[PDB]
Symmetry: none
């Protein structure tokens, strides 16, 4: 029998590695239907101008863009499936471009500090997207500086921190930055800056946390979260982490500059504290982790066959934080209250259906973190 389009595959957010031999990018879309559906792609809300003289070409629903470039192709794409019965739109997919420029060719400033004092070297990474991973080189590639408790590289800024400088630190320093996309990895490093040391200060001193984490970190359920904390101090301080709670018993989560929380959930929300300590004293720093969640369906609409003149009750309920807002679509178009149709939140109610109400409908749930779609075909029969 004949039935409206039903998505089996929708476009996914895509990051295209600039430069790669690949001279084109494809956005997937497939909808089963009877008769088979036809497709149309929209970018930033506007339909794509196809044709032989166009950079776009379709391959059974999938959109193919030749010679992709950010200046012209970066944006949000949507797939529209249509057939005799009706039309439904797909989730939107963002197309972004990855890149990593070299550091500047300018020589880097030297640093002179009293042996014993801690010091921070600034990376100043070049333009790039998406975020990079960082390491530092001593004198030459590939002499990377190990994470040995006294030397730490922030993965947020790329800056190198030495808790207590020592004579062995004399040398030149370079920031090494890496971009990893799919299976492709590209690294670039800066010119080297010379570290010299003034007469030593052998006096011990209490720790002072220099590298910290945000006052507020927002993460989504299922995501992984990493917080950083590093201090200067003599002797080299030791770092410990804990989550504040009612319990008055000692509980530690990490004994390293980094605190990792896998597959976070709502229970992980709270205030976390980093403690840096040595025989001279201690320093602490606190910040919060707030847990939100992308929308997800709890209840959705399903194909319904009703008799003409009848009243129908349709609804969609979605979870998420912040609480998502539900809206509706009719054959790919926004559906609002009207003659015999009342749209209030996730509830759609028809008053005395008409043979013409038949078609494809979709309820959309959205919040600051994402959007989800649910579709169904309504068949009003006399």
């Amino acid at each position: 029998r004949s039935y409206g389009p039903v998505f089996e595959e929708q476009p996914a957010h895509t990051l295209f590695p600039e430069g790669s031999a690949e001279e084109k990018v494809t956005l997937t879309c497939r909808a089963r239907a009877n008769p088979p559906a036809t497709y149309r792609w929209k970018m930033n809300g506007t339909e794509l101008k196809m044709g032989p003289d166009s950079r776009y070409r379709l391959v059974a629903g999938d959109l193919v863009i030749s010679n992709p470039v950010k200046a012209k192709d970066a944006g949000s794409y949507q797939c529209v499936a249509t057939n005799a019965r009706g039309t439904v739109v797909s989730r939107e997919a963002s197309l972004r471009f990855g890149f990593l420029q070299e550091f500047s060719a300018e020589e880097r400033d030297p640093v002179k500090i009293t042996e014993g004092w801690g010091v921070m070297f600034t990376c100043s990474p070049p333009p790039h997207y998406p975020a990079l991973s960082y390491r530092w080189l001593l004198n030459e590639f590939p002499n990377f500086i190990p994470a040995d408790g006294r030397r730490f590289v922030s993965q947020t800024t790329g800056n190198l921190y030495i808790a207590k400088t020592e004579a062995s630190d004399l040398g030149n320093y370079s920031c090494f930055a890496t971009s990893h996309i799919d299976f492709i990895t590209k690294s670039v490093f800066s010119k080297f800056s010379q570290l010299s040391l003034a007469a030593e200060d052998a006096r011990q001193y209490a720790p002072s946390i220099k590298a910290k984490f945000p006052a507020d970190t927002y993460a989504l359920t299922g995501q992984m979260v990493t917080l950083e904390c590093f201090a200067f101090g003599n002797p080299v301080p030791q770092i410990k982490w804990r989550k504040l709670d009612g319990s008055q018993t000692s509980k530690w989560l990490s004994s390293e500059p980094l605190l990792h929380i896998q597959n976070v959930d709502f229970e992980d929300e709270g205030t976390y504290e980093c403690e840096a300590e040595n025989i001279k004293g201690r320093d602490t720093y606190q910040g919060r982790i707030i847990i939100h969640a992308q929308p997800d369906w709890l209840d959705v609409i399903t194909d319904t066959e009703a008799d003409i003149g009848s009243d129908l009750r349709w609804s969609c309920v979605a979870s998420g934080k912040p609480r998502p807002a539900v809206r509706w679509l009719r054959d790919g178009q926004p559906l609002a209250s009207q003659n015999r149709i009342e749209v209030s939140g996730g509830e759609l109610r028809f008053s005395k259906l008409v043979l013409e109400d038949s078609g494809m409908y979709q309820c959309v749930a959205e919040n600051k973190h994402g959007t989800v779609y649910a579709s169904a075909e309504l068949t009003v029969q006399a």
Copy 2:
């Protein structure tokens, strides 16, 4: 001038290939000194009973064992260098014996499975040491089964996995095991088990990971790590690996059943995920890699000449994970707090030295993964 023993060559862990024409094994040891030092070897803490009627013989410090056998020679050996000035002990060296027995002579059980289903053949390797490398033979040697994505041999168990059985799999199967020690290689293979197939199931099905890796893998810095993952599925699934991180961008490390990480360091610690996918669905499995490190010296004692009645400050600092514990030795004997000697961790302090305190001293740093030694000669002069 006269000075205590100083090691130039210490014994190394040794694996002796049983059977080899070599009818003796040698453990190296050499210490420079004035006058030249004398040597003594200890096994499992007890000194070796030398002599002409003994299986042991010395060759300028090196220990030579005639007709080595596990039942009597397997153990930990230590070299002791001594001269007028004092005594120092060497790092310990383990002597182990390599072997590989044949598989049992018993016939192997046949296997019958529905064509389309995946299947696993159990190797059940015979007694051996150290770990072997594995392959499987089809019908006869040397018809090895290639790693073609559909057929995989676990290097942990030696088991053969076929992701989706097909008519071409009909035949007999044997587990081929290889021991490689130094330049010597020895392989043995099992009798063959017959694979027969029942009427085919042509229906496709989502992947299911059957061969996995440990929930927790501990590796040492500089070491190489290999993780395995293989699934049954129709169509044959494709495997992909990634390390979980804060970054929300797609990053893959391998597109094969094996994931190899060369020269691991602390940054490689984390949770890794194997994904098996085909057009019907996907399966995943996660496990962790934890990075530790053998002790290494940061600061050690050096020959010191102090005046009688003087106070001396000696210390040794070592890196490593878990944090190593430092202990001391005086002329090869455990040194603990006493009259004028206070031993606290890696620090040794004498209160008003005496002409008799002169001698050889050693600080030892140890953790679950290894031990390191540092020595120096103390010369108390009036």
